[PDB]
């Protein structure tokens, strides 16, 4: 198993400061960009920051909501990525994950921080051996391979793993029933013969030049 393990979360007062850590093991950490993504009590994922490689001089990008309050950094000889968070506010409350690789294959367990458009189907019901298709549409125009659509699965409850990256590339070890596509102007994920264990929320993410946007997630119920 690859492993990413976050730490440093907890309880903070508004105006407060917190630094999160994430340690990578079981793969070549320094060959990949890393990202922080946060979930939040309303369910739903928000990309927070990325950091690239040494050869890029460790260039970083942030979501506007956190720009100038958060800092992402990494230490390759430690297999670690960091998120320094200043001036927290109530709306920063959530579960934070470090995630990366092709492009969101791997996710940590999440660390909780309490401070105290991309369109998907809302919900779908299936059963084992049916085929189901989920779609991911962009309001800005057509989805293309330049959006590097990813699909990520959130099992009950807060267990994330990447299924698809680069539009139509299964991440390693992902079961063959998950199939990524571009169909007309949307990205899509097909489960070609659902199994009982596929009950989960399925999120897509698209790339827009220098940031990711995650869709709202599709809730998949599997009966039987």
């Amino acid at each position: 198993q690859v492993q990413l393990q976050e730490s440093g979360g907890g309880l903070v007062q508004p105006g407060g400061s917190m630094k999160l850590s994430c340690v990578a093991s079981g793969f070549t950490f320094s060959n990949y960009w890393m990202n922080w993504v946060r979930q939040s009590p309303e369910k739903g994922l928000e990309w927070v920051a990325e950091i690239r490689l040494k050869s890029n001089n460790y260039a970083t990008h942030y979501a506007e909501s956190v720009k100038g309050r958060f800092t992402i950094s990494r230490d390759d000889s430690k297999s670690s990525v960091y998120l320094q968070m200043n001036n927290l506010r109530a709306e920063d409350t959530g579960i934070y994950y470090c995630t990366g690789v092709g492009q969101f294959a791997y996710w940590g367990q999440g660390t909780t921080v309490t401070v105290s458009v991309v369109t998907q189907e809302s919900a779908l019901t299936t059963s084992p051996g049916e085929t189901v298709t989920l779609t991911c549409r962009s309001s800005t125009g057509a989805v293309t391979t330049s959006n590097y659509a990813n699909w990520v699965q959130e099992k009950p409850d807060h267990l994330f793993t990447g299924l698809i990256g680069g539009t139509n590339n299964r991440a390693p070890g992902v079961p063959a029933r998950f199939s990524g596509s571009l169909i007309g102007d949307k990205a899509a994920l097909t489960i070609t013969g659902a199994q009982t264990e596929d009950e989960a929320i399925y999120f897509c993410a698209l790339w827009y030049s220098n940031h990711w946007v995650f869709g709202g997630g599709t809730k998949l119920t599997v009966l039987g």
Binding site: Q103, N169, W207
Partner: peptide, 6 residues
């Protein structure tokens, strides 16, 4: 354009 490394 993002991290396309396999």
């Amino acid at each position: 354009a993002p991290d396309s490394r396999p």
